[PDB]
Amino acid sequence: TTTRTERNFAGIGDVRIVYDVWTPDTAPQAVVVLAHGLGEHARRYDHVAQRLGAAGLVTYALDHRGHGRSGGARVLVRDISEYTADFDTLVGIATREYPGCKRIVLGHSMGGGIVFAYGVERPDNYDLMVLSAPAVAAQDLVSPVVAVAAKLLGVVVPGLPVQELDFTAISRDPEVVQAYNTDPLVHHGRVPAGIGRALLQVGETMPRRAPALTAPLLVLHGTDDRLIPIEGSRRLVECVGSADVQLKEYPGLYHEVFNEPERNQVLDDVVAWLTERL
Ligand SMILES: COc1ccc(Nc2cc(-n3cc(C(=O)N4CC[C@H](O)C4)cn3)ncn2)cc1
Numbered sequence: 001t002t003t004r005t006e007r008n009f010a011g012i013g014d015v016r017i018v019y020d021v022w023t024p025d026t027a028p029q030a031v032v033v034l035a036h037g038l039g040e041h042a043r044r045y046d047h048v049a050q051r052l053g054a055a056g057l058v059t060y061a062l063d064h065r066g067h068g069r070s071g072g073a074r075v076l077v078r079d080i081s082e083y084t085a086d087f088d089t090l091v092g093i094a095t096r097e098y099p100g101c102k103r104i105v106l107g108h109s110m111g112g113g114i115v116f117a118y119g120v121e122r123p124d125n126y127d128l129m130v131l132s133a134p135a136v137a138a139q140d141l142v143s144p145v146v147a148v149a150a151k152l153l154g155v156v157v158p159g160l161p162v163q164e165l166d167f168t169a170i171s172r173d174p175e176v177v178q179a180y181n182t183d184p185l186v187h188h189g190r191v192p193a194g195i196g197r198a199l200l201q202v203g204e205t206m207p208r209r210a211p212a213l214t215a216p217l218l219v220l221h222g223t224d225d226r227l228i229p230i231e232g233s234r235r236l237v238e239c240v241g242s243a244d245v246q247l248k249e250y251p252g253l254y255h256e257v258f259n260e261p262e263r264n265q266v267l268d269d270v271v272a273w274l275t276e277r278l
């Protein structure tokens with residue numbers, strides 16, 4: 001009952017940014033603008049958009065530069081502002097197309113870092129924020145060696161590999177891990193210096209900037225997340241300015257709560273939270 005329409009816009013640097021619009025066959029109650037994480041793409045969110053559409057929400061979801069169907073050197077970025085600028089363009093598209101709708105910004109992992117960074121820069125451009133295991137404390141995740149390498153090299157050689165990732169940690173469903181590994185649109189390499197630098201840009205300023213986030217905020221995190229420790233989300237909710245902030249911890253879930261076996265429970269919680277607050 002929710003149909004997908006694929007479009008594109010010209011991002012920073014004239015990069016082709018592909019995005020999906022998911023429209024339910026019911027009067028739209030709000031728009032969701034969704035940012036995926038490192039190395040994935042927006043078509044890993046079909047079921048999320050479909051569940052949101054069943055609640056009457058319209059979802060806009062882009063493939064970030066260097067990801068999925070969009071253009072750009074794969075996983076290449078030099079500054080967090082490249083990602084947030086294209087996210088801002090997508091928010092503006094949704095705004096001009098549904099000007100009577102509240103706007104929800106939703107991000108997972110690196111995309112949660114993008115959404116947080118957007119949210120502190122444009123805190124009056126959206127109404128509600130939802131974050132899935134947001135990468136807002138990346139500095140606590142690498143050795144100082146990787147952090148120095150990324151900071152010094154991320155503008156000059158943004159494609160240089162600086163860290164391996166355990167792709168088996170994305171989900172405890174082997175079918176999800178298998179589908180990731182066999183997806184031709186997904187990045188199967190290492191974390192490069194440029195994305196490293198961008199994540200550090202978010203993580204190093206999060207405590208100082210999070211007071212500017214005053215919109216209602218929902219954070220979702222699996223307690224068994226081995227990629228982004230849940231301790232970082234616990235710290236995030238202590239630093240934001242919002243009085244209406246919640247961390248929903250899911251015991252035993254891995255990183256991708258929206259893809260875990262319990263995903264329909266997770267998405268029920270998101271829909272309940274959103275419906276209370278629109
Ligand atoms: C400074 O440079 C670095 C610093 C820290 C690290 N450490 C990390 C990073 C991640 N990330 C996972 C994502 C992501 O968006 N994902 C993956 C799962 C889904 O596909 C979305 C982004 N970062 N996971 C675990 N350890 C690496 C380099």
Ligand SMILES: [Cl-]
Pocket residue numbers: 161189190
């Ligand atoms: Cl690589």
